Paper text:
The ASU of the [name]–[name] complex, solved at 1.90 Å resolution, was similar to the one of apo-[name]: it comprised the 4 A, B, C, and D monomers, with chains A/C and B/D forming the two independent intimate dimers and the biological unit rebuilt using the crystallographic C2 symmetry operators. Even here, none of the protomers in the ASU contained a complete electron density trace for the ASFL. All the active sites contained clear electron density for the L-[name] ligand. Positions of L-[name] atoms were superposable for all protomers except protomer B, in which the L-[name] Cβ was 1.7 Å shifted with respect to the corresponding atom of the other ligands. In the case of our structure, in all four [name]–[name] protomers, the oxygen atoms of the Cα carboxylic group of L-[name] are, in fact, located in the positions normally occupied by waters W1 and W2 in the apo-[name] structure. However, because of the extra CH2 group (Cγ) in its side chain compared to the one of L-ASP, the O atoms of the Cδ carboxylic group of L-[name] do not coincide either with the position of the apo-[name] W3 and W4 nor of the L-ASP Cγ carboxylic group O atoms. As a consequence of the steric hindrance induced by L-[name] “misplacement” in the binding pocket, the catalytic residues T12, Q63 and E283 are shifted from the position usually observed in both the apo- and [name]–ASP structures (respectively). Additionally, w II, which is involved in the second step of the catalysis that resolves the enzyme tetrahedral and releases the deaminated product, is absent in three of the four protomers, being present only in protomer B, where L-[name] has a conformation more similar to L-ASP. In the structure of [name]–[name] protomer D, in which the ASFL is in a conformation compatible with its closed position, the placement of L-[name] inside the binding pocket causes the shifting of catalytically relevant residues from their canonical position, causing an altered chemical geometry in the catalytic center that, in turn, can explain the less efficient catalysis. According to the collected data, the ASFL closure is less efficient in the presence of L-[name], very likely because of the steric hindrance deriving from the extra methyl group of the side chain compared to L-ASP.
Bacterial L-asparaginases are amidohydrolases (EC 3.5.1.1) capable of deaminating L-asparagine and, with reduced efficiency, L-glutamine. Bacterial L-asparaginases are homotetrameric proteins of 140–150 kDa. Each subunit is built-up by nearly 330 amino acids and consists of two α/β domains connected by a ca 21 amino-acid-long random coil. To obtain high-quality crystals, we took advantage of the highly stable [name] L-asparaginase, which shares identical catalytic and structural properties with the wild-type enzyme, but has largely improved stability and forms highly ordered crystals.
Numbering used by the authors:
A (entry chain C), D (entry chain C): 1 to 15, 31 to 326
B (entry chain A), C (entry chain A): 1 to 15, 36 to 326
The structure:
């Protein structure tokens, strides 16, 4: 049986971290499980320090186990998954899992999610697919997966390109793998980093104030992600502030508040004229992840656009 | 044939000579209210449309409002709450340029006029008609950045579908709209200041602080999950709510309700949960709620009724 | 607390001792009507349920019908048309075995009892409650073979969502149901014979012929696209319709309506278009239509009202 | 500019077949287009003869062009696409396209669909992805694509595993390719075949008659696909008839009328006991396609199951 390490970041999702083999006994039949509690927070409080800790821990311990399961709150699991997708250099399976119902509730989903997460982490076919999220019997790639519903146990979906595989009776039929470069195919190396560039997100809507953008500019933010309207469009005053900021060296990425589809280039905004970058299918919080990492290598917008075209 | 007024707010989405077939279904008159891209939509345009519709209700049988798609879902809900005409009011746009191949404008406008001319469309609130489907202004949202099929009432579904100029309506919104709401903008020249802040890992409190520092009347949080807030943002909005600012917890998550009685003790902090209203829609209702009350309990009641 | 009757048609989906929390929301009494897998569901079970509900309506405050998921969408629509009790009638099942990890039965049953106990659930027709969502028996269908979230009202959306034992109902079906329909099965021991044939490339006419040869009262076509038929199948159903057999064009396509006035001249052939009713649901209504009429125009009217 | 051949099977979808460069002039700017009318039928009348004609024509003419666009009715395009996905041996791009609105209607979708189909057929990156369906700005693989709505121009979706790529401004960001074996990676060779094994489809529902199944058995059908309920389940009398048939050498595949998800093995039906095959995510009409082709190589159910696990 394979050795699987569970890295916990929050409360339990089934039934300390060493107690999960008791909570979900069937795990014994599929893996030799060891648990470590990395942090214990709600994922609404996820932050750069925990991301760096997780990436370094996985990269350091890669040789000591056959795969990783990370238990994580669902609120920001899609952010952590993509960060790790880009910074983990272990090509053994790394699988994130959470639960939408409390472990104490009727029909709690945590136990079967964890079982299926371990199944996936133990499946040799899961390797080299990047970091994965396993929720509701489905294997999802860390780039495209997103929380689509506030309460549904089926909330996590790779809205644009679909899941990689479905799990039935502890076996996975994989039919897809992400084409975008991940893990050891990216140049992002966080092994020595203590911090990440500062990147904030502003929202666009009718009559939007420019004060959120201005405040981030005034604080010297390295980059700003716009949750635009439609195909990445900006309310005039937010546009104005970000246009000025970009000329001063602020990296500016146009993403969209629209939950599916790509903020494309060659649409309504002349990105080359303004020094902006279009985020593609990356939603604002995912665009932030890649923008922070891009900024550890380049402040040049054309090179950042190239990064957003490859990863 | 019904008299239908088209109120234009942007460029043409088609091209009445553009769509001659309108003549077969209505007597169409057009007035250009403003001409802007809807990414620049604003309070002033909203007030103008609501007043124009309420003033001209008796002069026509229904209204079509051509509009850019980017913020159509916001305008539709504002009008859904403030229009007192219960004749059909229908919003429509195009996802492809009117000069492009397989432009969607022409048939979208046609079906929008069909809807506004249909007696059965009355009393259903303000409507959005896109891709052969009639959608209520409360639940409708733009779900994809480029798809002609982008508009969907994601939580409760559409009211009806249009085939060959006929609508089979099977649903009507139960939340109170138009003449069933207390919001009256007839005499207002401005709306309370309400902004939106986004939550995400490591979120800065600076957007929230800047709105507070500017004396905003309300702040809508685009929370994570079921309305949750990053600690720094939580800290600032908790202070705002005890300091005069209405705080509504919505969610960046595209479907489902920011519920009461989850992880945030809204009663303790003075917060309001937005239900299925997404951030930009929650903003619409909060602004209007603030024209009537600043009490968080009374705003929650508004968010439970409209 | 309301008196709620649970009518079981299969094995347990949970395990009242199984779900003790029911005691907090209702006084639950259980009767096992049949015990079968719903892939074996049949006319006799349908008649029994409709009669039992109509007879015992006055003795209880609402009903939950535990049921296998495979044909739940069929039974729900039959009861939606034939139940004359307008107290809540709620159907529920489980997509995972009650002994498996994270079994969905227990919370599904709990929410089903919540729904049947909610005064606001009355007069909405027969309901299916699955994955925290209240769905009308007409539009609800099983959309995925294994997902706990499989049940969706794909065309018009759900009626309400359930959070913490509370439902926010925002919709109700406009099509006529329960006591608003003329279908009365109180005195019937059998239903007209109606079968379903599938269309696909190179489709054999032999399934259709076999139903005709057996004297079937009606045939539902699971057409391609908007109700279209493979030539051989067309030829046989055209003959059937002129020879005593009611023919309803539905579609294998999982969402959207088989419309009148598309590629098939239904008036010429004596056919009926099923609207948004999929094949198995179209069968339900056609059987009931046939207890009242054989006239294709009158059956089309039924398919436009129910 | 690449040479693209348009094989028409039905009426025009834009604006004879040689007239399409006039109907959609912008095609001139992206390809040298030549059209041939293979048949002219509505796709509700699609049949084995047209499938064989198309596969042989593409395999024969592969060296004479840079890619193929097949114009086809939408009703059965998902069947033809999968048949060709399994029998075309040209790994140059083969793209199917149709229109949901008549060419004469307001906002007809045919013209832009054809343009995008040619874009896809001309994109070198489209090669080696199997046979494709391009509809509503989306590139879909021929195995998973299905018509989900009776009238919506956005009807075609790869419901289980998602699209391969999206098209914006005549360029495609491909992020996925089908893992299941297609085209030159399958053993199905129709070059010499004049007919296909007879395979019919029966539907399951409450109180379902066994007469449709019996009739196909009595006619000596080589195989029967069950559009089962739920996870491939059968009404008792249909079950009985198909169980008997399988013991007599009839190939029996359990698919499902449920529009998404896989008819799995190891669920409610003991397929090994009965000699049945589970169709996986193949819906009934797609299962028919693979079953017919399997039957040109084997009547053994375990080998057919293996085929349904690989293709
Ligand atoms: N806010 C909690 C919700 C619980 C959960 O879904 O994990 C978290 O994200 O950690
Ligand atoms: N930004 C444009 C998009 C095009 C349109 O929808 O008309 C607008 O929303 O006005
Ligand atoms: N074939 C079973 C599936 C399990 C269930 O839904 O209870 C049935 O429909 O009865
Ligand atoms: N029955 C026609 C419909 C037209 C179409 O959508 O192509 C066909 O499939 O050919």
């Amino acid at each position: 049986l394979p050795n699987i390490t569970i890295l916990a970041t929050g409360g339990t999702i089934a039934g300390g971290v060493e107690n999960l083999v008791n909570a979900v006994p069937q795990l014994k039949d599929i893996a030799n499980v060891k648990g470590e509690q990395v942090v214990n927070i709600g994922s609404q409080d996820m932050n750069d320090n925990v991301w760096l800790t997780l990436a370094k821990k996985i990269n350091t311990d890669c040789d000591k186990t056959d795969g990783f399961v990370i238990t994580h709150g669902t609120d920001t699991m899609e952010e952590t998954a993509y960060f790790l997708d880009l910074t983990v250099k272990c090509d053994k399976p790394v699988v994130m899992v959470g639960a939408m119902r409390p472990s104490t509730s009727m029909s709690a989903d945590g136990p079967f999610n964890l079982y299926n997460a371990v199944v996936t982490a133990a499946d040799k076919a899961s390797a080299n697919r990047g970091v994965l999220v396993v929720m509701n019997d489905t294997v999802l790639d860390g780039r495209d997966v997103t929380k689509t519903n506030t309460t549904d146990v089926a909330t996590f979906k790779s809205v644009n390109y679909g899941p990689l595989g479905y799990i039935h009776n502890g076996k996975i039929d994989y039919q897809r793998t992400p084409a975008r470069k991940h893990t050891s195919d990216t140049p992002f190396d966080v092994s020595k980093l203590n911090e990440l560039p500062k990147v904030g997100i502003v929202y666009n809507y009718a009559n939007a104030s420019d004060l959120p953008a201005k405040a981030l500019v005034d604080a010297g933010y390295d980059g700003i992600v716009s949750a635009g309207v439609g195909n990445g469009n900006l309310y005039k005053s937010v546009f104005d502030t970000l246009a000025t900021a970009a000329k001063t060296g602020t990296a500016v990425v146009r993403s969209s508040r629209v939950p599916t589809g790509a903020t494309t280039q060659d649409a309504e905004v002349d990105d080359a004229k303004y020094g902006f970058v279009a985020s593609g299918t990356l939603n604002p919080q995912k665009a932030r992840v890649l923008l922070q990492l891009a900024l550890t290598q380049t402040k040049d917008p054309q090179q950042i656009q190239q990064i957003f075209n490859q990863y």
